[PDB]
């Protein structure tokens, strides 16, 4: 099968900033 798009992981950035600072 085909992989999903790299862009389908974009929301991890928001998750990251939930738990960690810049």
């Amino acid at each position, epitope marked *: 099968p085909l992989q999903p798009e*790299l862009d389908s992981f974009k929301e*991890e950035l928001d998750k*990251y*900033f939930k738990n960690h*600072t*810049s």
Partner: antibody
Amino acid sequence: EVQLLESGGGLVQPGGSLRLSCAASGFTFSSYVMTWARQAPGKGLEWVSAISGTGYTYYADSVKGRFTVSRDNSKNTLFLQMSSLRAEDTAVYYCAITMAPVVWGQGTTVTVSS
Amino acid sequence: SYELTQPPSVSVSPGQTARITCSGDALPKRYAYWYQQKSGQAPILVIYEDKKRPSGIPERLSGSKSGTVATLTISGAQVEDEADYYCYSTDSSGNHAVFGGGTQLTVLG
């Protein structure tokens, strides 16, 4: 404290191989895409590769077929296996978190030369 | 290969507003991201998802996107803002990411 510790860079002859490593701590590593980027001396940033937590892999056209990205979630480590190295692969190589690099490693220098 | 187009150089007077553009055919459907790199340093993310500001980044820095053009706006420019700024996004397929060529910001005076 989030830490990305890179290793594995060095001088390699063209056609040689190198394995870069990025040991992560301070976050749930298996929850995140990890990204490789690079910067040649005096040039711009270039996206190299990315791997999702569950192992989906993505590659720049300039390295596809020569580089393999991998990860070990149990050891919180990201790898870039480089093969068929060319002069144009000379660069500082960075690992970073998520598909849009948010926290960057400090880099490891790869020099491809005879 | 999908590419993002940035001007190589932008200059701004102290206290004025710098606008750095980044054009690409997939930008109407793909988020833009912006990085700041000062000489001899690793890059820092300054804008994500067109317009979101990471905590700690100055409010003077903002991002916007319209059509095929994303813009990083730096208002009240200070000498400390001199750096190379790179936009970053993904292609129409969504399977590759790419940086723009970078824009060197010069603060005049």
